[PDB]
Every structure is written in C-alpha cells, then in structure tokens.
Design a protein around this ligand. Structure first.
Ligand SMILES: C=C(CCC(C)(C)O)C[C@H](C)[C@H]1CC[C@H]2/C(=C/C=C3/C[C@@H](O)C[C@H](O)C3=C)CCC[C@]12C
Ligand SMILES: C=C(CCC(C)(C)O)C[C@H](C)[C@H]1CC[C@H]2/C(=C/C=C3/C[C@@H](O)C[C@H](O)C3=C)CCC[C@]12C
Lengths: 10, 239, 239, 10
C-alpha cells in the first residue's frame, strides 16, 4: 500500500 | 509589530525548502517524454506532474511539524492536496502576457489547448486559468507564496486525516505567521490575507473537478497506461 | 517436397504481422524518455521495453489460433514469453560490427554498458549478447525469424497455461511449418531446425535470469517507479 | 487484474 510514497517520505 | 524569532525561522526553513525543490531553469524538462501537439500531450504532462509530486514531497518533508505526523497522515495529506500544491507552485511559471505556463522555448510553453490534449476539458482549464491570473495579480512575496502552499498542504479538512487536532494546530501556527508577515512586511496588504484564504477555497473546487476528470482517465486502460506509477499511486483510492 | 497451401498462408499472415509491428526506422524512439549515460538508462530502456510489449501483443494477436485461446491463456503466454520475444525480435537491430543494438545515431545505439546502467548485470548481459551473435550467425530468413517467435510464444511449458493440448497442437502446427520451410526453401539448412530449437532453450535460461534480476528491481520503489504501468503489469505476479 | 493487457488484447 502506497509503496512509492512511503519510500519517497524517507 | 515585529515578527517573532520562531516565526522567522518558520519562514526561513520554508523559503529554503522551496528553493531546493523548485528549479527556475526547468532544465529537467528535457528528461520527460517529449510533448506532441488521441491525447498527444498526456505522456509529457503526466511526466511533468509526476516530477512535480516528487518536488512537493520534498517540500512537505521540510515544513516544520510535518515529519512528526504519522506516515499515514503524511500520505493522507499529500494524496488529497498534491494537485492543489502543483496548481499553486505552477504560478511561478504562469504569465499574463501569454495566459500560459512558460517553462522553456515553445516546447515547454503549455497553452490551454495543450492541456486539453492531455484529457482535460475546459470546465477544469477555464477555472484553472482564471485562478492563475487572480493568483498572479496578488503579486505575492516569496515568503507568502511559500506559506500559502504549506497552509494548503496542512489542511485538516481532508479525507483520511487521523490527527485532526495536531494538523489543525500546525496550520494555525502557519496562518499566524502569514497574517503577521503580511501585516508587518507587506505595505498595502491589509486585505491580502483574506484573498489568499479565498484562494484555498478556489483550490478545493479545482481539486474536485480534476479528481473527477482524472477518474475518467484512470478507468480507460489505454490512457492510464500512459501515466507514471507515482501518479497512479498518489491519485488513486487506497488506505 | 513442396509446402502445403495451409502452411504458406500461415507463413504469409505471420510475415505480414511482423511488418505491421516492427519499424525498421525506429523513428518512434524519439518519443521515449531520452537515454542518459544511479541507473541513468533505466527510464529510456523501460520505455523501450514497454513499447516492445505493445508490439509483441500486436504480433501475437495475429498468430493463427492465438485469438481463439481464452484470454487467460493469452495473458499467461504473453506474461512469461514477452522478454524472450523481445530478445528474439531485437536481433533485427543487433550488429556484429559493434556488438550492440543499433537503432539510430549514437543515441539509440545500446552498448552492453548502457544496459548495465539500467539495473542489469553481466551474468544476464553476457549470455544475452552471446545469444544474439549466435542467433545472428544463423542468418535466418524472414520467414524463419517470424516462425521462431511464434513457436516461442506458443510454448505450452509455461506457468499458468490452462489448455495444454490446444497450444501444444498450435506450436506443433507451427514447428511443422518451420521444418518443412527450412527443408524446401533454405539451401544448406538441413542442420538449422535443431539450432533454432536450441535457441529456445537458451531463451528459457535468459528469461530465468532476467526475471530474477527484475525482481530485484521491482522491490526497490525508487527504481520500480521508473518503470511503466504495462511493464509492471506484464512482469509481475497475478492471476 | 491485468487491466492493461485485457484492453490491449482487444
Ligand atoms: C495535465 C494535467 C494533469 C494530468 C493528470 C494525468 C495528472 O490528470 C493538468 C493539471 C491539472 C494542471 C495543473 C498545473 C498545470 C501546469 C503546471 C506547470 C508546472 C511547471 C512548473 O511551474 C513546475 C510546476 O510544478 C508545474 C507543474 C501546466 C500543465 C497542466 C497542469 C499540470
Ligand atoms: C533493459 C533491459 C530490460 C529492463 C527491464 C526493466 C525490463 O528489466 C534489458 C533487456 C533484458 C534487453 C533484452 C533486449 C534488449 C534490447 C533490445 C532492443 C530493441 C530494439 C529494436 O530491435 C526493437 C526491439 O523490440 C528491442 C527491444 C537492447 C536493450 C536491452 C534489452 C531490452
């Protein structure tokens, strides 16, 4: 769930 | 009659964060899928938005207090405010001379007609352009533009926010900064704060029309396959 | 000692389908995200592959008998054969003079070192290049190249195929065409059919190494966000 | 499930 955003949010 | 030391540090770190995440040269636009002028503009503008979301995330992570929110509330806030912040930050490239967004030569100059060729209709682009020229005529300071984006982003009245009080207090601390800033540092701006808060209400109504017109895109796989994975993730419905 | 009327119609519609879905000018490559030479090549090659999958789907839909399969088996066959067909069709641009794929000027000429800058290692690119020069030295007719791709695509020994007998019979009908073609129409090719069937076994082992190296990409969101929605859908695990 | 491929496969 929200793979990319979690990564982008450090 | 003088800004607090806390209030200027807030202004400082918000202005520095905007400079780290906004390139006035737009030189990175050569890395997007080129524009074509069927939905010929959709690959280039989908790349443009996807890049912009990455910049908004970089800005948000430096708004004082945003990092201490749960990751859930951070995602909730970014998912529903992203197109408003893009519409807000895009005013730096808007121009009244052409009524377009001028980010380069003729290639990265985005007419109203180009954006229609990306799957959006006048009923969004008409209020959006009008919003941009009104916003442009406010002739905002850098400190105000930057504060307005963070106030927009920290709206507690957004689907899925859990900690309503924590972000409401954050948004309040930022509005106090903006109200004080305008009053101390902006001659002739005694009516300005009300006009910026009006612009937030304009953003909600533009956000609503975009997300509706985006649903119509994302349901056609031939068009949604032209998007990027970040776009799809940010503008879709999940937890 | 002479091709059946059925066998030449099969050859016809397979050769026409390859011409509709393979552009020798590579002019569409200007529409991809430009190459850069961190994984600098990944956006351009991810676009290149994504485009190629769309072409392979166009080719497959014109292989006699492929449309009558269930949509499930069609998807099963395309999901596990796609990188092999791309590796196969890519031989039309490979060149022994440079050991690269030459699709344009210096921009769309793809060295071994460019593909490493897309997140793949020598243990794939070394057997892949070797595969290409062996394939190139077979000096295949257009009719054989085209038949080999369809035989590759119609492999019943692939995860998730339901109708093992229906596709096995289709692949058999195509292998008979290729065996007869080589024997009737290809002087000095009496050892060729065995060498092409060998190339299929090479493809499985390259497919296996790619999908393993792709899993390592798709688990890093910073890289997977550089892919396209079609790529992600075709190379991921679903029903 | 396989949204795009179903569409691409007509
Ligand atoms: C195609 C569109 C979206 C398609 C999808 C697929 C997302 O629906 C329409 C959007 C609604 C509008 C809003 C802002 C609009 C623009 C901004 C210009 C800039 C340049 C620079 O100033 C950086 C800045 O960040 C920025 C984004 C001009 C193009 C249309 C834009 C994205
Ligand atoms: C980056 C790669 C994949 C990344 C992902 C993200 C998918 O893992 C590596 C692949 C394994 C290999 C195999 C073929 C290889 C090539 C083909 C060239 C062409 C040009 C033309 O002849 C049309 C033809 O269709 C075609 C595809 C050269 C680049 C590397 C290529 C894709």
């Amino acid at each position: 769930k929200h793979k990319i955003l979690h990564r982008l949010l450090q | 009659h003088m800004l607090s030391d806390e209030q200027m540090q807030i202004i400082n770190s918000l202005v520095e964060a905007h400079h780290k995440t906004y390139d006035d040269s737009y030189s990175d636009f050569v890395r997007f899928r080129p524009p074509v002028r069927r939905l010929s503009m959709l690959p280039h503008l989908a790349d443009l938005v996807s890049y912009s979301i990455q910049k908004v995330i970089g800005f948000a992570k430096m708004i004082p207090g945003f990092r201490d929110l749960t990751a859930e509330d951070q995602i909730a806030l970014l998912k529903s405010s992203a197109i408003e912040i893009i519409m807000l930050r895009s005013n730096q490239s808007f121009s009244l001379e052409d009524m377009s967004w001028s980010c380069g030569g003729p290639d990265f100059k985005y007419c109203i007609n180009d954006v229609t060729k990306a799957g959006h209709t006048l009923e969004l682009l008409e209020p959006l352009v009008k919003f941009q020229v009104g916003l442009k005529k406010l002739k905002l300071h850098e400190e105000e533009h930057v504060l307005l984006m963070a106030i927009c982003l920290l709206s507690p009245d957004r689907p899925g926010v859990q900690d309503h009080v924590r972000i409401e207090a954050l948004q309040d601390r930022l509005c106090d900064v903006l109200q004080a800033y305008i009053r101390i540092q902006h001659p002739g701006g005694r009516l300005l704060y009300a006009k910026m808060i009006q612009k937030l209400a304009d953003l909600r109504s533009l956000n609503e029309e975009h997300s509706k017109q985006y649903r119509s895109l994302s349901f056609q796989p031939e068009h949604s396959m032209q998007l990027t994975p970040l776009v799809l993730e940010v503008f879709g419905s999940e937890v």
